[PDB]
């Protein structure tokens, strides 16, 4: 399919069909196939595709917590070379929120 | 391999702490000086091998409250992780 990188379109993506756009592997996925991130390779080993689907833990604890509720993030606005600073958060329960200032601020969207 | 240095008794804020991060771990120019910017620098951007040295531990717990604390922990969680992170505390 055509890439889906973008937070309406992914937002959407996620809310309708429970799961991410095909162009998002996670870090372990896309080392396995010879992405070093300090290198920026991951558009080399792994054309179209984005970073995204891992556990994101909320360190920080700005995004809502729950009695089972786990988030997960994913890489928005990527293309290729080295990674940017947008993010989509997304929860067990659909709650999607985004961050465009590598994680200092967080935007509820969905 | 990359080393970076942390002084511990030139901590004097959570700010300094982050900031010296970003030098010594050569990270994003807009990079987010949190945990969360942290944790996603040590996965998805940072040079390894790496060694940490953190000197002073405690002197730079001081003035960071649970920064220090909270920093090693990322750390320690990136190395649990699979990166290859060697932290040294003195």
């Given at each position: 399919?055509?890439?889906?990188?973008?937070?309406?379109?992914?937002?959407?993506?996620?809310?309708?069909?429970?799961?991410?756009?095909?162009?998002?592997?996670?870090?372990?996925?896309?080392?396995?196939?010879?992405?070093?991130?300090?290198?920026?390779?991951?558009?080399?080993?792994?054309?179209?595709?984005?970073?995204?689907?891992?556990?994101?833990?909320?360190?920080?604890?700005?995004?809502?917590?729950?009695?089972?509720?786990?988030?997960?993030?994913?890489?928005?606005?990527?293309?290729?070379?080295?990674?940017?600073?947008?993010?989509?958060?997304?929860?067990?329960?659909?709650?999607?929120?985004?961050?465009?200032?590598?994680?200092?601020?967080?935007?509820?969207?969905? | 391999?990359?080393?970076?240095?942390?002084?511990?008794?030139?901590?004097?804020?959570?700010?300094?702490?982050?900031?010296?991060?970003?030098?010594?771990?050569?990270?994003?120019?807009?990079?987010?000086?949190?945990?969360?910017?942290?944790?996603?620098?040590?996965?998805?951007?940072?040079?390894?091998?790496?060694?940490?040295?953190?000197?002073?531990?405690?002197?730079?717990?001081?003035?960071?409250?649970?920064?220090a604390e909270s920093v090693l922990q990322?750390?320690?969680?990136?190395?649990?992780?699979?990166?290859?992170?060697?932290?040294?505390?003195?």
């Open positions: 399919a055509q890439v889906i990188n973008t937070f309406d379109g992914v937002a959407d993506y996620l809310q309708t069909y429970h799961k991410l756009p095909d162009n998002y592997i996670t870090k372990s996925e896309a080392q396995a196939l010879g992405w070093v991130a300090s290198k920026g390779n991951l558009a080399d080993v792994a054309p179209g595709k984005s970073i995204g689907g891992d556990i994101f833990s909320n360190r920080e604890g700005k995004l809502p917590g729950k009695s089972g509720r786990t988030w997960r993030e994913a890489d928005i606005n990527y293309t290729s070379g080295f990674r940017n600073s947008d993010r989509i958060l997304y929860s067990s329960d659909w709650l999607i929120y985004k961050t465009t200032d590598a994680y200092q601020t967080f935007t509820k969207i969905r | 391999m990359k080393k970076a240095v942390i002084n511990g008794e030139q901590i004097r804020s959570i700010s300094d702490l982050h900031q010296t991060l970003k030098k010594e771990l050569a990270l994003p120019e807009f990079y987010g000086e949190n945990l969360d910017a942290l944790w996603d620098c040590l996965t998805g951007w940072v040079e390894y091998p790496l060694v940490l040295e953190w000197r002073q531990f405690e002197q730079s717990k001081q003035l960071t409250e649970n920064g990322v750390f320690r969680e990136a190395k649990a992780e699979g990166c290859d992170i060697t932290i040294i505390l003195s």
